[PDB]
Amino acid sequence: TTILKHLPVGQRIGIAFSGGLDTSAALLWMRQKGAVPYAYTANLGQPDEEDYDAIPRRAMEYGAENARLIDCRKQLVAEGIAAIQCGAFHNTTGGLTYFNTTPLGRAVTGTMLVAAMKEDGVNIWGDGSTYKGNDIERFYRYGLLTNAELQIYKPWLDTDFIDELGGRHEMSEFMIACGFDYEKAYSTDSNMLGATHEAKDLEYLNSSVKIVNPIMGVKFWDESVKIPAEEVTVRFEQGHPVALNGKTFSDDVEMMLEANRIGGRHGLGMSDQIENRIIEAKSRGIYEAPGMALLHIAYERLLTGIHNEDTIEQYHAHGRQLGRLLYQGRWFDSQALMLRDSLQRWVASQITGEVTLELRRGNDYSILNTVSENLTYKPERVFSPDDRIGQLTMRNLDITDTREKLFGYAKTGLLSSSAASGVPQVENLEN
Amino acid sequence: TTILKHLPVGQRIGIAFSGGLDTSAALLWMRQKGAVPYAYTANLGQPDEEDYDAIPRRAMEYGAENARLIDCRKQLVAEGIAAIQCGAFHNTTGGLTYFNTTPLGRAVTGTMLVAAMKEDGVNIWGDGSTYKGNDIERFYRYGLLTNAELQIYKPWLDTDFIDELGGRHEMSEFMIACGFDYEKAYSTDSNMLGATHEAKDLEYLNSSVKIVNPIMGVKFWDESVKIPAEEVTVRFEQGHPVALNGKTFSDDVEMMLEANRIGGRHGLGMSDQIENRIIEAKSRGIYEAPGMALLHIAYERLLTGIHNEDTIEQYHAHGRQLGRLLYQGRWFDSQALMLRDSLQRWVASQITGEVTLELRRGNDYSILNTVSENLTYKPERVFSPDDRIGQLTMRNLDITDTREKLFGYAKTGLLSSSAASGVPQVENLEN
Amino acid sequence: TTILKHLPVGQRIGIAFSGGLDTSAALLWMRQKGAVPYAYTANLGQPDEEDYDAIPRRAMEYGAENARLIDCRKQLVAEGIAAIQCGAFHNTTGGLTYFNTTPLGRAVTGTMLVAAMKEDGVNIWGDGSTYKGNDIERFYRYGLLTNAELQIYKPWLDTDFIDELGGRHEMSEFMIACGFDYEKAYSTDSNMLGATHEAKDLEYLNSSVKIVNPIMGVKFWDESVKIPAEEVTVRFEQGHPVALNGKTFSDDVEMMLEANRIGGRHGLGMSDQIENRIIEAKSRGIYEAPGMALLHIAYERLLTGIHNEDTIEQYHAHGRQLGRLLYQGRWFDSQALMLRDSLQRWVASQITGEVTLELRRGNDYSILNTVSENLTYKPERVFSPDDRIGQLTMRNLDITDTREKLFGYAKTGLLSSSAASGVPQVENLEN
Amino acid sequence: TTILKHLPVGQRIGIAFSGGLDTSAALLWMRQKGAVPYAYTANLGQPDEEDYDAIPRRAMEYGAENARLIDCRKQLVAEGIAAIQCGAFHNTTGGLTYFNTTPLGRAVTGTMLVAAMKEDGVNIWGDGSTYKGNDIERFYRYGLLTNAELQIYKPWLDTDFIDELGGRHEMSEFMIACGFDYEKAYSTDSNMLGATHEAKDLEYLNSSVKIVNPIMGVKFWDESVKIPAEEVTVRFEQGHPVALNGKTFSDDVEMMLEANRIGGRHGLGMSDQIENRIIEAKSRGIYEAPGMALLHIAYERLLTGIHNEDTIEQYHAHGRQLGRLLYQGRWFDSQALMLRDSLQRWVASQITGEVTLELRRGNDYSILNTVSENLTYKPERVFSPDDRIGQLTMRNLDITDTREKLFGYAKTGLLSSSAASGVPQVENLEN
Ligand SMILES: Nc1ncnc2c1ncn2[C@@H]1O[C@H](COP(=O)(O)OP(=O)(O)OP(=O)(O)O)[C@@H](O)[C@H]1O
Ligand SMILES: Nc1ncnc2c1ncn2[C@@H]1O[C@H](COP(=O)(O)OP(=O)(O)OP(=O)(O)O)[C@@H](O)[C@H]1O
Ligand SMILES: Nc1ncnc2c1ncn2[C@@H]1O[C@H](COP(=O)(O)OP(=O)(O)OP(=O)(O)O)[C@@H](O)[C@H]1O
Ligand SMILES: Nc1ncnc2c1ncn2[C@@H]1O[C@H](COP(=O)(O)OP(=O)(O)OP(=O)(O)O)[C@@H](O)[C@H]1O
């Protein structure tokens, strides 16, 4: 089988080790019960993490056979930039978008840590994501995709485990009992692309961003917090974000880190979404992604000045589709690769230019300038009145056909046959 | 022919009379040259219009055989609400949307004024839209659609006319010469759904919202302008917006007028778009639509809590498609009616509920509450760990197929065959 | 729970009783083991069924508390006609289509039999579909959709059951042992809309239609079988198929039965498809649907003469999407209803006319005539050379933008910069 | 201007010279009137053309300054194969498809002949396509795309020309008068990918394929014509068609020529389509494309055995969209390149395998075998009954939401609240 319901005694088990209580207690438990756990910690540039190096040490202290720190920032930022280039975001509300930051983190974490484990001769994976969420499924697909012989063991869904220790307090009393010493209004996941806040009090639709203490930006909704308007420039070269406020970077990680600081000072990008889980039930989250939002705005502004209507519609439609696949843990499936590759090659390749913005609070900003060697937009941009008259006349054929259709629809009752207005009246409950 | 290149002497000609210099001079000229012009003015609830009644009088004074004021507010608001229900908006940049307010105005104006003219035995139409824009084509389609025998005469594209008087000063000197007495950094069109600002200085991408004196809201970008945060509630009943801040209205026109005041105090909805004209060339505009934006945000928030993923994706895809048809002057074509009707019946019908927002400046706002008897979202909402294990296992078949595809793509060079990362590397210029 | 793993002793259990060995043995077993089974047989107009009345009698003989025959033909044909109107078919190969006949049968069977059971105070359902196929899931969704308190019991996935009797021979020896007396190269499912043939020898891609003994048509691939060319006319009225060869019918069931005879004499509609199961693994089937195919061809021919390009594209795109939802057992989900309703109202409503065809063997036929009061097509159908010149000239703006894009793509290596042909060369493995 | 209304005396004019009466008379006339015409003939592998070499000679005899024969077969076949790989076909009726053969011919002809002309210092183009069709616009876009300074001169839309000689007889009397010596039920255009038949008697929907004398295949509808069943194998390697009946070819042109012979003996691929012109009016045509059809069938059969559901849906949707762009003369526009490139790279690259078919008459054939190293389909292809039970159970959340929606739709009147059937009844004219 793929999913082992019980602890594989004596077997080498890889654990995606975050360092929290859940994985610490599970690691200690798996060792105590006879398994040989190996710890793998992903450096994802978590904004509230200042000492990634201490994590593998705690894993060793708790029983890990070996513990490694895998740096995933470069790959994370590369995929985040690809998402920006593809507009691979689908959970939107009134124009505010969730930038699929956790989905991106799992795609890189799931593949890189499993590759690292297979490299160390480890073919069993364990991660603390619960059986009720999206993550459990994302890690599942990316892992089996990377290692065909990968088997999954999640002690948290093992009777023997859940039996004795099953709650937070249960795990804490367990650590104490094992000889080792050692709560918000919501849970937070984060990486350098963004932070998500969900569960607990955020489960209630009457809670709001007001109970959140943002970790990548300021509380822009608090009028007492001072936020000076700020001018910012964002420049792209062939789809690559290369300069912020005229400064370049040694690598994309440093660029994204700076994008985060700029948007962070304003709270740019924060949204509140009710979304659909992979298991077709809804969930609610409050999200942060200051740098992604900054790049996304500049990218789209350039896009509107550089590409034609049909190409921009493909960016939107293929982008939304890709966003859903990314969210489902299918970022590397053939249908996703095809959409991503096509958008990167034909849309992003031409995105060269610079956008100037004035940022104030949250999502309030203004566009101040747009420049590009590739613009198809031109001020006061060729044809005569007579050329237009002919073009207008060529429309008569189709207008006549449409007029006949309206007559036919009125006849069959879809449009009111009695409309002393001139405005066709569609016959449904709303009109 | 349909488009008459020269003035039809002695013939009754209908003129969409706005009251501006252009149509005033044209009316006087057409009468002077032998035609029998009839004036029709549409009451569209233009925000900067306080005396619609005086317009037909000026038409009479300038030579109109008869002049009528056609009230189009009810139809305008009805179509605007339908657009909200259908998310019929397509020009977006970073989540900021143009609400197709001029397109909606033309659809109602073009049909209603032509119906009024045909009613008075008038079968020739003239309107001052230039031969370089979208409007000329919108009025053309809606008119011929409403009156099969409609012929078009636009003096502004008549040699005899353009010859003598051809400029603004030319027309002004013409009025004076005819015995009658009588400039911004951009041109403005507006109706009660919104205001558009384009041309002149706005043709330059280095101009911005800063040179605009908004007519439906405040200058939220001016830090010296004081804008108190404000809580607002918006309630829908079966897709119909029925209450604002707990108050109902005698009709939808009054509701929209109030929505405008609420969003106006904050500058909600304002955007800057580079878009594609019907003639496939780009144009730039700065837009206002405070009430539409307010309703749009609340509607979408409810939508995310009430409908499933596939239904919401149809709202987005069909909505964007509909927005483009609306923009092209095809709001009543069969393909548009089908999308609009389907969305009104199956999506809007279930949109019942109330959304509470906190508005600050421009597009900076927060969602404070979302309630609905039709929510499918439920706090802490059924299945066991074992149920999930089986569901996860059912994925293996497709994961194996995908793994084989990745192998095949690496083999054919689409993915790097040499990737010591674990993260598949797509082979294109961006990666 | 929803799915009962073990027999609910003493409880009333509803069984979708087909009369085959599987359900006969299961019914006898469930009674013998203490449950109180009720039998429900759906009359679906199975082509190879001549005595539906005897089925409930055999159920009574085997232990059914009560047995009913539910006529589902009218609903089946109504849904089949809706599918035709919506082009709700998605498994196609070289233009040959699977008409989703089993999916349609399950939607009507699953809802109607469950309603019948709930009517008799029965709230547990059992059906013999295996745990490896699509059907098990289709019946599951339609049942719970119709009865919220419905619980599922499938003895075939019950250890106690599978234990003792688990094979065909096991069940046969069981009947004998219980006091009652009593194999092709593939399995067949069928209803009056079509017949499916799959499994066994058809699992192999080197098998073909040659091993199939069609039950709704002749062996058109056998040159020794004589098939006279035949002229046939098909007439629709507002989307409803009303006449075949000039004759009308007392109801749609009789019309479909005649459509089947006409197409059957030729083998019209037969296809061989490799498709994707709901569980994302592939399956292979050989299908028959002579009447559906006949109506589908005539409907589409009229569609091409009556509706415009955008409307026809929506028919194809929304139709394919709907076909997939139908196949998944989601024919009544909101996203499906929206697509189906929109197509029926705006596309089908205008389909009035008659198509004449000459049928020969299999899918070889010719179109001989197409007539319709609603045609927008007209022989030698308005504009001048000068009108076209202007229209062509209006294209220059976009052509220039496209030329600049080609230059940009060549520059970035997507198109060959070295092409002494004039034909742009896309840079990928295929060119 | 771009389109010259009158003959540019003394100027070098390039003429796409087919050799027919129309271009022969125009060439002679343009020389006689003072222009300096250059002739360019495209070798497109026209099936009914046995002496392409004589064409430029006749051009020289009629006054051409120089005349060249440009071989376009290789490029034509390359683009035709790309279309097959992308399923770039959109005019379909009952599964029968028009393979966009003229659109492909114009894309190669328009670009290659203009490049040849610009090469000879010729910057004015003339072609005999009428102002009422699609071709005039296709040649227009491909030409200006290839040569920015290209100007168009079509004598057929020149008053001076149309004045004196305007009809066929007029042109014939003209040739005689100039010292040179020298009708079906429809017009035919053709190249090695296919033949189109339209106009004249085919304008009437009561005409049929029976009045057509096919030029690429036999009259399969004539029962007296003997057509022996034939087995054929088609093999692809990474999307490239490489073998037919086990034989390979020196180049793709020879392969396509053989594909044509094979399908031609049976009349495979012939269809009758009512379609929409670029100018939104309908037209009718009868088409031949035996080789394209043969490759298309084999390609799709392999596609169904190799790619997953989402990837196949993209092939269909993106393919149909691409087909429309191709038809409009936009085969090289950015939105087309993006769709074509994505499909070639991610779908076609994996199409390796062989399909065996039995061809009889017209579109009647059977699939006999399908093999591929890349198949994801496998006979008797992993999961247990318990795994399926859990997977089925995970559906309850969404089923409950859907049940609530049905209740809501019944409440708002979209579904009958009174349905003693169990089958939800959609409330519209069709049900
Ligand atoms: N930086 C990291 N390195 C390695 N593994 C990690 C890292 N961050 C998270 N994980 C793994 O992912 C699991 C889930 O993450 P986390 O506990 O933060 O999520 P959550 O908010 O509880 O949501 P869910 O349970 O749905 O995943 C952790 O138990 C751990 O196995
Ligand atoms: N309220 C109205 N009632 C009747 N006709 C109107 C009204 N508003 C505008 N029109 C008609 O529409 C024409 C175009 O409107 P307007 O002059 O405001 O547009 P514009 O900004 O110049 O842009 P364009 O020229 O592209 O339309 C006017 O010349 C007039 O004929
Ligand atoms: N006419 C009918 N009336 C009632 N129930 C039926 C009828 N036809 C089929 N069924 C039910 O559907 C079940 C599955 O049908 P059948 O055995 O014909 O399918 P199959 O070819 O074995 O494929 P699968 O197992 O995937 O359904 C039967 O066991 C029976 O419960
Ligand atoms: N092989 C060729 N080489 C060069 N030019 C060609 C060739 N075939 C066709 N053309 C050009 O295309 C024009 C149109 O082709 P043709 O006359 O065959 O089309 P048609 O059936 O009359 O339809 P339409 O007028 O709509 O193009 C010809 O007048 C000629 O200029």
Tab-separated table of C-alpha atoms and ligand atoms in Angstrom, chain D residues 16-18 23 40-42 44 52 106 109 113 126-130 133-135 139 187-189, ligand 4:
chain	number	residue	atom	x	y	z
D	16	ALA	CA	-0.051	36.495	-57.505
D	17	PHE	CA	-0.421	34.776	-60.874
D	18	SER	CA	-2.460	31.590	-60.959
D	23	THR	CA	-5.040	37.171	-63.687
D	40	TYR	CA	4.681	35.098	-59.008
D	41	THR	CA	3.158	31.654	-59.128
D	42	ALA	CA	2.987	29.447	-56.080
D	44	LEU	CA	1.029	24.425	-53.896
D	52	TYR	CA	3.271	24.536	-63.102
D	106	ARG	CA	-3.121	31.620	-48.057
D	109	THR	CA	1.202	31.944	-50.249
D	113	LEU	CA	5.080	35.481	-52.474
D	126	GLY	CA	-2.274	42.571	-56.613
D	127	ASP	CA	-4.329	39.386	-56.369
D	128	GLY	CA	-7.629	38.479	-57.997
D	129	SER	CA	-9.589	37.558	-54.854
D	130	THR	CA	-12.959	39.351	-54.922
D	133	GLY	CA	-14.802	36.974	-49.765
D	134	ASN	CA	-12.401	35.832	-47.064
D	135	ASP	CA	-9.307	35.585	-49.246
D	139	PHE	CA	-3.908	38.038	-48.428
D	187	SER	CA	-15.824	27.050	-58.210
D	188	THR	CA	-12.861	25.086	-56.895
D	189	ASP	CA	-9.747	26.093	-54.991
E	4	LIG	N1	-0.963	29.014	-57.135
E	4	LIG	C1	-1.111	30.335	-57.023
E	4	LIG	N2	-0.025	31.158	-57.148
E	4	LIG	C2	-0.177	32.483	-57.032
E	4	LIG	N3	-1.322	33.167	-56.796
E	4	LIG	C3	-2.415	32.306	-56.675
E	4	LIG	C4	-2.399	30.922	-56.772
E	4	LIG	N4	-3.675	30.379	-56.601
E	4	LIG	C5	-4.411	31.444	-56.406
E	4	LIG	N5	-3.723	32.652	-56.436
E	4	LIG	C6	-4.227	34.056	-56.255
E	4	LIG	O1	-5.429	34.039	-55.468
E	4	LIG	C7	-6.504	34.687	-56.188
E	4	LIG	C8	-7.783	34.027	-55.750
E	4	LIG	O2	-7.780	32.632	-56.103
E	4	LIG	P1	-8.931	31.950	-56.935
E	4	LIG	O3	-9.253	32.808	-58.107
E	4	LIG	O4	-8.540	30.543	-57.182
E	4	LIG	O5	-10.132	32.017	-55.867
E	4	LIG	P2	-11.697	32.077	-55.934
E	4	LIG	O6	-12.250	30.692	-55.944
E	4	LIG	O7	-12.092	32.991	-57.055
E	4	LIG	O8	-12.100	32.808	-54.499
E	4	LIG	P3	-11.736	34.281	-53.910
E	4	LIG	O9	-12.084	35.212	-55.011
E	4	LIG	O10	-12.600	34.412	-52.713
E	4	LIG	O11	-10.283	34.174	-53.624
E	4	LIG	C9	-6.153	34.519	-57.646
E	4	LIG	O12	-6.830	35.548	-58.360
E	4	LIG	C10	-4.664	34.725	-57.584
E	4	LIG	O13	-4.280	36.103	-57.490
